[PDB]
């Protein structure tokens, strides 16, 4: 009973002759090592929620070109790979491969869902567009 949430959300009987444990078995592949490797590889995939609206309607993310996004993310993945393998230069690189990939894109906060730029947040666009209609009481 009373399972809490995790996200704010709102709207004669002697000893039997067979039981014992002392020693005399060590798992060869390594139970703790395999267990840690499983713990590592068990993690859910990352959430890439850029270019998606907030609740107010403003697409979340940084303001820079999508190709720059792709290159920066490839570089960041290479750097994180180098850190994970504990070397100054990563061996499995995602950037500066032999392939020409100059047409690749990604999802930044620069473009909204209409296809237009994101120089202004949608709240600001809507507010300015609605401000050009309001009248007032006569003097």
């Amino acid at each position: 009973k009373r399972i809490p949430r995790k996200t704010k959300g709102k709207s004669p009987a002697t000893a039997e002759p067979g039981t014992s444990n002392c020693e005399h078995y060590k798992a060869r592949p390594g139970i703790a090592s395999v267990q840690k490797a499983t713990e590592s590889a068990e993690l859910p995939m990352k959430n890439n929620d850029e270019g998606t609206p907030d609740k107010r309607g403003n697409t979340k993310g940084a303001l820079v070109n999508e190709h720059v996004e792709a290159r920066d993310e490839a570089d960041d993945a290479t750097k994180k790979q180098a850190k994970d393998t504990e070397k100054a230069k990563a061996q499995v690189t995602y950037s500066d491969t032999g392939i020409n990939n100059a047409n690749e894109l990604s999802r930044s906060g620069n473009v909204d869902n209409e296809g237009g730029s994101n120089q202004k947040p949608m709240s600001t666009r809507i507010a300015e567009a609605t401000s050009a209609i309001v009248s007032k009481h006569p003097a």
């Binding site: 703790a32 090592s33 393998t85 504990e86 070397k87």
Partner: protein, 147 residues
Amino acid sequence: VDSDEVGEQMEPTFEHAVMEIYKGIAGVDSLDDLTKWVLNSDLVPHDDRLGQLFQAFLPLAKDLLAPMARQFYDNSMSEGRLLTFAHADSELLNANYFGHLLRLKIPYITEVNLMIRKNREGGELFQLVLSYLYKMYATSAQPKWFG
């Protein structure tokens, strides 16, 4: 002369100075997390992580321990002949030690004593990682049989 004497005579003592080494790492946040990030579920730590830790441990040993020892061993040499111990020949070589430099070695597995003994500063895992660092600061040469 005990092996710890040259490191104990400092306001932050040497082992206390190296206990704060986990701040330089990319992220550890605690000495126990350092001992867990270094060697896995037995000894024989990860060589890459041990290297990342040694690159920080070294400047503490070249800039503090060597200058302090260069004066301590002179003060000791002034007041008579003494039999002095150390944890690595580099300690007696960097700090310019005068006398006979006898490397030595024992017929046991020294790494298990670091778990048997209890009341040492920092966890037993920290004493052991410290021993690994000294062993990595060792300038390979024949230890030649303490007997």
